[model samples]
Target: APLTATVDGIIQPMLKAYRIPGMAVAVLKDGKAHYFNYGVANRESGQRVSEQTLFEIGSVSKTLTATLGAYAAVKGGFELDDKVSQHAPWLKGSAFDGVTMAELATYSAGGLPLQFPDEVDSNDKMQTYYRSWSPVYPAGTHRQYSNPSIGLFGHLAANSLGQPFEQLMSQTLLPKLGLHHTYIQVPESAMANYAYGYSKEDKPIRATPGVLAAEAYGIKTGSADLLKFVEANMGYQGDAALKSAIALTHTGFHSVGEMTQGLGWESYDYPVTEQVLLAGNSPAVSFQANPVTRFAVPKAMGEQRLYNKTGSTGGFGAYVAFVPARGIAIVMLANRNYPIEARVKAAHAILSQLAE
Candidate 1:
């Protein structure tokens, strides 16, 4: 009843306070998945949001992308330590000479920018961008959160598997993981379930295509499907490679203070406190130009550990988190890009209570 009361108190107020048009939420606890949706899916039509309604998951898509990469590694498609040039020999003599796929995936490849320059769009341009890149710090030294860095990482993951990133994701990864409605590109039929996202100015917008679009943040999925995705990660089953593939993404390769990197995922060791969450989601951590790195994962178990990813675009916002030891997971999606604090606070409040 507290969880219900708290969520009810939070969702409606949040929709109004943040100007969100519609949203969907899912919570998995005690071997059950609970779902709730609110507001309008289409403002002009006044259609209510539904569990099947899909919304752009923004950067949270990175986790799924990262898993595909990890799958590549476990499947013998590539090595985590493989250099960027190993996959795309195009960069053999370029500025990215020594950067490894692991470093790029972990966001510790020196200091790649948070995003590509506006003019960098095509494949040719992306090649040029990497050729001319200058890391602010030596590779393995700084912990910068970069879209291009991980975008390249995801690109190489798909490349090693002998297909394009989007193809591998849509055709291979999603289906292998048992996800029916998650998409890198929404098909025509799924369009009806797609919710229109609104920007701060209240203008409708969607994710635009680019060189690293699939790698960075290009996924539209329904609440039911994403819940399945989260649940899969929390309790992945199947064969050797598939099992190892799931664990690969959760391997902490680099640590930035209390925050750590595990491919596309982020988690902190035992008893994730608010202050720890603050550091992990802080501006300095999220937008660092230079950061020192520690490469050890705390040996936390159960609800003591924190695993999560936060995503946003100009029009949409999303958050997905889980506690492996406790077997708890929750996801939130909104039509408007709201605050990270709101997402963390709500999850912390609800999950913490359920965790107790």
Candidate 2:
């Protein structure tokens, strides 16, 4: 029960110091999961956080999008190397000129910005944007995380699957993985269980609704559901397509900063040290660029690793990490957008203790 011990000494102290209004923590060890909830889901009415409570997972949804893309590729949708213009033929002459689906999947698509700017908020505006948009570097030359890159990636993946992204995720993907309460557009009944994310100003807020929202940062999930998703990533579930998709996600193609990026997840070798975790999760590596490097999916998933993703909306923050070799996984969901360093530190501390 050192995990419990870590909760008091590490997790609690951090949460209090961070001024988190509500948070959910789940750990999966030896195939069994222990879940803990803290603070209040709603600050005014004081709703308690619970297993069923839904939290917005933000860009953690990128991994899900990657899963969908890889699943589509496995099922003959497109290769990671296929140029986006192949699917969106309309882009034939544009700057997406040499950009491949693989580069887009890994955020190495030349130099797409982190977000689709507000000025390009409309279709007409975006049309002008892309027409004017050009890659700063050749495809596969550098790494830079951008929403529009993966947004287009998902839009095309779903196009290849012949369905809308949200419908595909809600109707087919999540269900195939045995998730019930997780949703992009959470149903009315789940509203009572939905935790309102609090802003830094102590105001209630939610993820902004906009273009490619579903494809970018639109998933709401519970602690139990998220943990199971993590387990599935560890090859715990037996669905062939789902398993393949999960394994494909860990196919590290390039290393940037202190991190190695797979389709969506970033990972480090097992028995991770403090410097490794810090460098991997550091924003410098995540957003800023190193020279572009490329990798291929391994013939087998034999590498022991600690895989992770950190996510945030305007107000909410979330993090999930796992080590398949050790059967250890942890997810930290909080209503307020907090530091990624804090999440990495706490998870590293807990995992280190668990290893002992």
Candidate 3:
């Protein structure tokens, strides 16, 4: 009840400030799990937020995508150093031909845009866009934080494993991770439990299909499953191979500002400053290009590392962060697309207290 009060005191004000209809919070402390729910999943229907309510997790999905890519690598489906053309043979002779898989996974494939062009919304057009693409800088030379970049990485990973990205994620990776309810595509049977996210104008909405949407930002999950993922990343629990795959995702490939760019997540040296964490998750870092210094030898996750990521779709916002040394982590999911700073700040506040 004290934990609930702590979470409520921090989150209740945030929900009101942002007009979020519903939210879910999950904390993992010293291998124990805590969950807190707030508001309604649907204001009109009056469905309550619960461990079973699914909210669109946006790019938090990318971590799962990254996990799939890492699984592909650890299982010999592909190596990070392999060229894009190795998996997408049709990409040969294009800009992607020269880009290594690692570049895509790291958002360092030169300067891909944050999203695919409005016109490039289909498989044929996506291929055309890639064929005609030109790098703003050499591959692996810049961190651009583009969905197209990592989306392609997921694509290539699934290609190497000879399956659709959604199928591999739902049937293989999620199963391996023991996540029963996380879905790349939420099935009709579970529609009643799916939360309707609120748009900027407060209209009910959900993510629509698009090119690489599933790979880039199309995951729906609850706090319970996501907390398990956080625990898995901490080496607290998971299948041996899945745990190793998670570790591979945490491997530091490039230095981007104060953050170390891992596969689908970005991290910092633990005991990190609030100022540094805020700046690392700032819009400038998300929307602008930054030069990256490749680690001579990629660094593995250390006890002192803090891993975090923020995600949002048109109507939903989510944040996840964990410190292995402290054995603490937090997951925040909301039905409204609210401020990243608020999510980061609240999680920071919650973790600071829990770790103490």
Worst 10 residues of 2 by lDDT: 294-303
Provide the global lDDT of candidate 3 against the true structure: 0.90
lDDT accuracy of residue 69 in candidate 2 = 86
Give the winner by lDDT: 3
The ten-residue window of minimal lDDT in model 1 covers 295-304
Residue pairs whose backbone atoms clash in candidate 2: none
Q: Is candidate 1 or candidate 3 better by TM-score?
A: 3
lDDT of 2 by residue, 151-232 (tens): 8888889888898889888888899888898999989988998899988798999888888888889999988999988888
Clashes in candidate 2: how many?
Answer: 0
Please provide, for model 1 over 1-356, each residue's C-alpha lDDT reduced to its tens digit, 9 standing for 90 to 100: 87677677777787889888999988888888888889987898888888789899999988988999999988888888877887888888865678888888978888888889999988899998888787778888788899999999999889898899989998888988888888888899889888888988898888877778878999998778988988887777786677777888778777778877787888888568776786688787897665656654422223356889999887899998888788888899988999988888877777877686
lDDT values, one for every candidate: 0.83, 0.83, 0.90
Which candidate ranks first by TM-score, i.e. highest? Answer: 3
Question: Clashes per prediction?
Answer: 2, 0, 0
Cα lDDT tens digits, model 3, 286-324, are 999999877887878676788999999999999999998
